[PDB]
């Protein structure tokens, strides 16, 4: 995120980090419950990637993080890789996340919900902070 | 990428106003936000766009794509969760 602000640790409890065997943070994801991860399809997750939960600082050696194995990758077949339309993949965990003060689920909308233009919403991430 | 978790507040825009910037690139299952002085960037993909409704944070977008450059004058394109949520319900249901 460009022009963000540092979040209050443990405050976006559903915010996971996608990392590779190497330990490289490659995309983000959101917990929708204890066994299930939501992310983009273009992030190209595989079963050797690790879902990392309860992170604030990828630099810390002292946080109580969970490194969780991916069992299955559910790529929405309505994903149109040329278009980048319907960009969503579900990731089923091999080991259920343990819910805590810092690991929790985000709520999902029902398909018939309205989110009007001009509404102030919030985005989180470990994205480039400057281009 | 920064070590520390960042956040940013920003506005949803309409698809219409959104094709004022992205045109035919903007499809039905995508939702736009930003162009506010903040921008999602490389490294944010898959991460959430949350709006609070009746006291709780609802997943309204999934960070998808935008300005090659993370221009903060260019709106970010996100996945539109309302359009994909039945697929999610259908998937959790089967497996």
């Amino acid at each position: 995120i460009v022009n963000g602000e540092e979040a209050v640790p443990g405050s976006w409890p559903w915010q996971v980090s996608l990392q590779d065997k190497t330990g490289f943070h490659f995309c983000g994801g959101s917990l929708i419950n204890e066994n299930w991860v939501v992310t983009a399809a273009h992030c190209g997750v595989t079963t050797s990637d690790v879902v990392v939960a309860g992170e604030f600082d990828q630099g810390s050696s002292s946080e109580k993080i969970q490194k969780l194995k991916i069992a299955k990758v559910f790529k929405n077949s309505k994903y149109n890789s040329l278009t980048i339309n319907n960009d969503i993949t579900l990731l089923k965990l091999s080991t259920a996340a343990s819910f805590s003060q810092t690991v929790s689920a985000v709520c999902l909308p029902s398909a018939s919900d309205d989110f009007a233009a001009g509404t102030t919403c919030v985005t989180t991430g470990w994205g480039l902070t400057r281009y | 990428t920064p070590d520390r978790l960042q956040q940013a507040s920003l506005p949803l825009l309409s698809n219409t106003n959104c094709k004022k910037y992205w045109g035919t690139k903007i499809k039905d299952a995508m939702i736009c936000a930003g162009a506010s002085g903040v921008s999602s960037c490389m490294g944010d993909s898959g991460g959430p766009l949350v709006c609070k409704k009746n006291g709780a944070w609802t997943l309204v977008g999934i960070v998808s794509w935008g300005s090659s450059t993370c221009s903060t004058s260019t709106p970010g394109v996100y996945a539109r969760v309302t359009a994909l949520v039945n697929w999610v319900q259908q998937t959790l249901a089967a497996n």
């Binding site: 979040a7 209050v8 640790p9 443990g10 405050s11 976006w12 409890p13 805590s100 003060q101 810092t102 929790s104 689920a105 985000v106 709520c107 999902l108 919030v122 | 956040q7 507040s9 609070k52 006291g55 709780a56 944070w57 609802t58």
Partner: peptide
């Protein structure tokens, strides 16, 4: 869901 145990401060 949706109600962090530690309040996001904006």
């Amino acid at each position: 869901c949706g109600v962090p145990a530690i309040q996001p401060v904006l």
